[PDB]
Amino acid sequence: QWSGARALEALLTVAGELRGPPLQLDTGQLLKIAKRGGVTAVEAVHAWRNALTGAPLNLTPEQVVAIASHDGGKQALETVQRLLPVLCQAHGLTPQQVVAIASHDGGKQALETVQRLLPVLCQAHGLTPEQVVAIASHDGGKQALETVQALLPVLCQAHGLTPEQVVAIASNGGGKQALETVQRLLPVLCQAHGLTPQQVVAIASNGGGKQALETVQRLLPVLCQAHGLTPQQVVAIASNGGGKQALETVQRLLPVLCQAHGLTPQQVVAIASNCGGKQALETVQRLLPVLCQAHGLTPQQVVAIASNGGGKQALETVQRLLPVLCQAHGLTPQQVVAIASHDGGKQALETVQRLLPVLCQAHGLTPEQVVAIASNGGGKQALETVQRLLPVLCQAHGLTPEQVVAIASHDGGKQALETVQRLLPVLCQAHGLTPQQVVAIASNGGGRPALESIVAQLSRPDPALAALTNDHLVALACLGGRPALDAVKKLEH
DNA sequence: TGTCCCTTTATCTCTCT
DNA sequence: AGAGAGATAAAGGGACA
């Protein structure tokens, strides 16, 4: 018989019992733990169910799932109940920071290394606890922390990097590898190829940073004699997760795409310059004729769709959904292109296909409004949040649909909508902002932190902002969000 | 296998003027 | 506002005990 059967049965028995108190996990949460943490993680969650949820630790089930759903999840669960109080009491970290550190493969190793190295990293090396947490919060966080401890001096002194740059390089999966490669390759890239340290740090500061750096060293000459690419274009392609893959694929496909479809090298670089650029490029070579055929999409529209992260997904989804969205949902092909041309275009297109009839019929929105909400990065999230929160925002908080749509229609729309729902009453009732002022602040990218910064200044007034009236703070918050507020704070000192 | 570490892709959010 | 920059999660494979 199949040898996985006993383990599967074990998995399903324990999984069954976890649906009950005190965690009450659903099918999704149970699969996710089983998929990454495996059977031992599911058993560990069960064995630890009472110790984790209530006093002292008081972790939400969602936090428990976050910790359990990684390789070594059983180890991370044991370590969190042991070290969370130690790290909160003795180093001043928050439970949320400890959970963040724990929620990666080898989370045990990261937690124990933070307990061990935070004092020396902050005292002897000048890092903040926030920076130590960022470094720790990735797979291999232990390796990254130990490599920062070892290399921070030689990187700053012998190689001229700031501590901030070292931290930025370290704060990715494989960070140890990127730091070691930057040490070796910084003078080579800078002195042989005229790259600035800032450009090298940018290439290094992604997952797989080591691979992108070595690939830049290898291919920069070939790409900048043969293909007429500039160093700046090469840097841009490499300054992204999977940079190595994008760069190699640009070498392969630049002449194919230019010659066979009349794309410019500019257009090719733009397609390549996202996570998954490799995937996007290969999909363009495949699908452009299919999309542009029989007077379909234009080349220019295909380039726009492809020129975002997940371009491959967006392209394939357009091919699938253009007819059904145009025929059945009444959208123009131009509106499908708009929705598709943002990171996560696939998700937004599918969510529009699913929610356009509902938002229109149940909530009284126009298709144009649904399209505008969808046509930003994270469009799926904004659309679902509008569906969820339109009745409460309108009926309980007195906003018009138009105001809700405005808040929703920027990157981070979901966050802005949730924060408005959260903070509208204290901003208006407790501190005298008008709803229109709250809507204005929230109706920009970064609407959520801009609102939180405002609430913070009204709730725990910093003297440095006291010379500003509420109306002035509102104007600043609309002008430049949290950063403007923070900038003003510093200017005062 | 279970655990740790590294890489790639996809998605989401905020910043920068 | 659209280009730039940065966070996070899923998922696969090397490595090794």
Author numbering: 231 to 723
Publication passage describing the model:
Transcription activator-like (TAL) effectors specifically bind to double stranded (ds) DNA through a central domain of tandem repeats. Each TAL effector (TALE) repeat comprises 33–35 amino acids and recognizes one specific DNA base through a highly variable residue at a fixed position in the repeat. The crystal structures of TAL effector (TALE) proteins bound to their respective target DNAs have revealed that the residue at position 13 is the only one directly involved in DNA base recognition, whereas the 12th residue stabilizes the proper loop conformation. dHax3, an engineered TALE protein, proved to be a useful scaffold for structural characterizations. We then present fifteen crystal structures of engineered dHax3 variants in complex with target DNA molecules, which elucidate the structural basis for the recognition of bases adenine (A) and guanine (G) by reported or uncharacterized TALE codes.
The structural observation suggests that Ile34 may not be a major contributor to the affinity of DNA binding by TALE repeats, consistent with the classification of NI as a “weak” TALE code. It also insinuates that base A may “tolerate” a wide range of amino acids at position 34 of a TALE repeat when there is no steric clash. To test this speculation, we generated dHax3 variants with the 34th residue on repeat 7 substituted with different amino acids. In total, we obtained nine high-quality structures that elucidate the accommodation of base A by Leu, Met, Cys, Pro, Trp, His, Thr, Asn, and Glu at the 34th position. Among these, the hydrophobic residues Leu, Met, Cys, and Pro all adopt conformations that do not clash with base A. As what happens to Ile34, there is no specific coordination found between these hydrophobic residues and base A. Trp, Thr, and His, in spite of the presence of polar groups, do not form H-bond with base A. They also appear to adopt conformations that simply avoid steric clash. These residues may all represent weak code, if they are used for base recognition.
